[PDB]
């Protein structure tokens, strides 16, 4: 038993904060929907509108809490409060799962359909709640007595909106909807979160990593050390002669290039350069065992080093190589940080070293990688709000259906945590401020 003033206060704090936050989330999602319609924006707009509807019902639940559960408002307001409070409480979980799945699929695999999915979520929640209420609520179709719709009167002078509803009728309705709109979306969200984590881990490679580090030039240029270079970090020669560089360029492409090439030629030269670096590792006694023991992402950081310095230059880092085979990531990093390579190209070296430390693509913050990070944050954030806010409410529905001998204190706590989804949802969906751009 929570004191009425504490219950009133908790509902008022969720309402006072939820009203501006959801007004800001709707604004953010509407802007994105108008500029470039995306499934994520549609799901975020529906969740924003839903949470705002739940927000506006919170003062009514606050005064009910202050009246110790009695309905201190006109009886005709009970059906309106019923739909404004409970339809968003169940629909929200559906929109969070939809949003999490749209974010995961959009990022791991880089409009009209999303509106259909939202209409289906709203149709199910409104028909499920509507049919049970219209038919089985006190004052409903099956009720023959002079009773206001949704109102029970356990004692004289004490009308109760919904909370005194016969459990034999409300219980199976709450339980079935909790399975479909909370537990299934919870599994979907948990699946998308894991999928996002896995997509970050195996979604990039050496080719993409070297493109960021090397860049692209269609004409012969002098690199950082002054050597004639072309394409994607392809060293033509160390010789102080442009004619020698053009001569080497012509033999590599098999055409009279005159120091200028095509993107396809530069790409084909880059592929030959990566295979050469891979060949150099496998033919080296100190490199091959290290490479074989390494995961896919760390193998790429090893190829990146060989591509930049050559097999021999890399084989000289005997302490770091031993450390890497021993899986002593921080000790290898500390050794590589004292190298001439780090002194000469610190930005490039820090990125490769961080890749050896973490085994992730985090140092290579490309558009694709950032989109995947964003997707993981939304799905992780959705999982947290599902478990903390509406989660205790849906677990209470399941607990009471299986063990109806439980008292009503758990449901009372779950309804308060459910109300706080109006605060946590706009904070996790990412449409506040500048947006998820
Ligand atoms: C069916 C209906 C009839 C109505 O008015 C018709 C009677 C008007 S009259 C008397 O002038 O003829 C008004 C509404 C909003 C509705 C209506 C439509 C859609 C949804 C709802 C709200 O339904 C529900 C159902 C449940 C709850 C809350 N609202 C509680 C239970 C189960 C859920 C829970 O505890 O999780 C209600
Ligand atoms: C809407 C928030 C106001 C909640 C009331 C807080 C005061 C608590 C006292 C209640 C006893 C007197 C009954 C007060 C009824 C006033 C009419 C009303 O609140 O209507 C709801 C509004 O129209 C929605 O659609
Ligand atoms: C008829 C459509 C189904 C709606 C009725 C479901 C009943 C509620 C249960 C779970 C809600 C979870 C909804 C999960 C939907 C996944 C959404 C999604 O991933 O959309 C991808 C997007 O359209 C491209 O990027
Ligand atoms: C994908 C998961 C969807 C799961 C949906 C399951 C709904 C279970 C229905 C129970 C009604 C039984 C009530 C009768 C007992 C009294
Ligand atoms: C999986 C979804 C529905 C299966 C329906 C199975 C419902 C079984 C309920 C039996 C019962 O609650 O009695
Ligand atoms: C149990 C609640 C789930 C907690 C997850 C929420 C935090 C999201 C973290 C994403 C990491 C992506 C960066 C790598
Ligand atoms: Na070393």
**DSSP states of 47-103:** HHHHHHHHHHHHHHHHHHHHTTTS--S-GGGHHHHHHHHHHHHHHHHHHHHHHHHHH
Residue 180: CB within 6 Å of ligand 3? Answer: yes
Structure tokens at 210: 């070297």
Quickly count helices (H) and strands (E) in the chain. 20, 5
User: Annotation-wise, does 175 bind a ligand?
Assistant: no
Ligand 6 centre and the CA of 381: distance in Å? 7
Give the number of other CB atoms < 10 A from CB of residue 188. Answer: 21
- List residues near ligand 1 (CB under 6 A): 79, 82-83, 86, 126, 129-130, 132-134, 149, 162, 170, 173-174
User: Quick one: which H or E segment has residue 161?
Assistant: strand 160-161
Sign of the alpha-carbon dihedral angle for 216, 220, 221, 226: positive
CB-based contacts of 240-248 (< 8 A; 24+ apart in sequence): 245/220, 246/220
- Give the rounded distance of the alpha carbon of 394 from its chain centre: 23
Structure tokens at 408: 């009503």
Q: How far apart are CA 72 and CA 274, in angstroms?
A: 75
Residue 20: CB within 6 Å of ligand 2? Answer: no
Question: Active site includes 265?
Answer: no
Say if residues 15 and 62 touch (Cβ distance below 8 Å).
yes
Resolution (A): 2.2
> What one-character-per-residue DSSP string does 283-297 give?
T-TTTHHHHHHS-HH
Extended beta strands in 269-375, E state: none
Ligand 3 centre and the CA of 387: distance in Å? 19
* 3-class DSSP assignment, residue 405: coil
Structure tokens at 290: 């290290």
Whose CA is closest to atom 12 on ligand 1? 149
Ligand 2 centre and the CA of 64: distance in Å? 10
Closest to 257 in 3D by CA, of 245, 267, 268, 246: 246
Q: How far apart are CA 9 and CA 67, in angstroms?
A: 13
List residues bridging with 235 in a β-sheet: 229
Q: How far apart are CA 343 and CA 263, in angstroms?
A: 32
Give the number of other CB atoms < 10 A from CB of residue 178. Answer: 21
User: Annotation-wise, does 307 bind a ligand?
Assistant: yes
- List residues near ligand 6 (CB under 6 A): 373, 376-377, 380-381, 383-384
* 3-class DSSP assignment, residue 225: coil
CA geometry: angle at 133 spanning 130 and 139, to 5°? 135
CB-based contacts of 137-142 (< 8 A; 24+ apart in sequence): 137/82, 137/162, 137/165, 137/169, 138/164, 138/165
Structure tokens at 349: 């070296």
Integer-rounded Cα radius of gyration of the chain: 31
Question: Going by DSSP bridges, is the β-strand pair 228-231/217-222 parallel, antiparallel, or unpaired?
Answer: antiparallel
Ligand 5 centre and the CA of 83: distance in Å? 26
Q: How far apart are CA 22 and CA 305, in angstroms?
A: 49
CA distances (Å), 186 to each of 93, 128, 192, 233, 420, in order? 8, 20, 10, 47, 17
Question: Active site includes 311?
Answer: no
Give the number of other CB atoms < 10 A from CB of residue 110. Answer: 10
User: Annotation-wise, does 96 bind a ligand?
Assistant: no
Q: Which of 51, 64, 213, 214 is catalytic?
A: 214
């Amino acid at each position: 038993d929570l004191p009425p003033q504490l219950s009133f206060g908790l509902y008022v704090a969720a309402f006072a904060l939820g009203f501006p936050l959801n007004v800001l989330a709707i604004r953010g999602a509407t802007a994105h929907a108008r500029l470039r319609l995306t499934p994520s924006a549609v799901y975020a707009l529906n969740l924003g509108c839903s949470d705002l509807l739940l927000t506006v019902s919170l003062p009514l639940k606050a005064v009910e809490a202050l009246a110790s559960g009695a309905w201190p408002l006109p009886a005709s307001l009970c059906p309106v409060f019923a739909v404004a409070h409970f339809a968003p409480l169940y629909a929200g979980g559906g929109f969070l799962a939809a949003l999490s799945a749209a974010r995961y699929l959009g990022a791991a695999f880089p409009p009209c359909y999303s509106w259909g999915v939202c209409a289906a979520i709203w149709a199910l929640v409104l028909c499920h709640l509507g049919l049970v209420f219209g038919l089985e609520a006190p004052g409903g179709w099956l009720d023959h007595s002079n009773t206001s719709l949704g109102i029970n009167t356990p004692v004289n002078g004490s009308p109760v909106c919904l909370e005194a509803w016969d459990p034999a009728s409300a219980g199976p309705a709450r339980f079935s909807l909790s399975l479909l709109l909370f537990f299934l979306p919870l599994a979907i969200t948990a699946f998308c979160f894991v999928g996002c984590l896995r997509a970050l881990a195996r979604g990039s490679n050496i080719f993409e990593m070297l493109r960021i580090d090397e860049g692209l030039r269609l004409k012969i240029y002098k690199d950082t050390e002054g050597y004639y270079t072309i394409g994607i970090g392809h060293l033509l020669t160390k010789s102080p002669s442009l004619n020698a560089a053009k001569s080497e360029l012509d033999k590599a492409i098999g055409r009279n290039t005159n120091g200028v090439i095509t993107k396809d030629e530069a790409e084909k030269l880059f592929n030959q350069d990566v295979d050469a670096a891979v060949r150099g590792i496998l033919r080296n006694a100190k490199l091959k065992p290290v490479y074989d023991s390494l995961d896919a992402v760390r193998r790429a950081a090893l190829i990146n080093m060989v591509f930049q310095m050559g097999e021999t230059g890399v084989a000289g880092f005997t302490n770091s190589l031993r450390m890497l085979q021993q899986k002593r990531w921080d000790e290898a990093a500390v050794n590589l940080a004292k190298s001439r390579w780090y002194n000469q190209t610190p930005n490039r070296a820090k990125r490769v070293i961080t890749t050896f430390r973490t085994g992730t693509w985090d140092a290579y913050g490309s558009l694709t990688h950032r989109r995947k990070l964003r997707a993981a944050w939304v799905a992780g954030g959705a999982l947290l709000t599902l478990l903390l806010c509406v989660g205790p409410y849906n677990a209470s529905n399941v607990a009471s259906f299986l063990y109806p001998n439980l008292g009503g204190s758990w449901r009372k706590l779950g309804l308060i945590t459910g109300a706080w989804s109006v605060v946590l949802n706009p904070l996790v969906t990412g449409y506040l401020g500048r947006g998820p751009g």
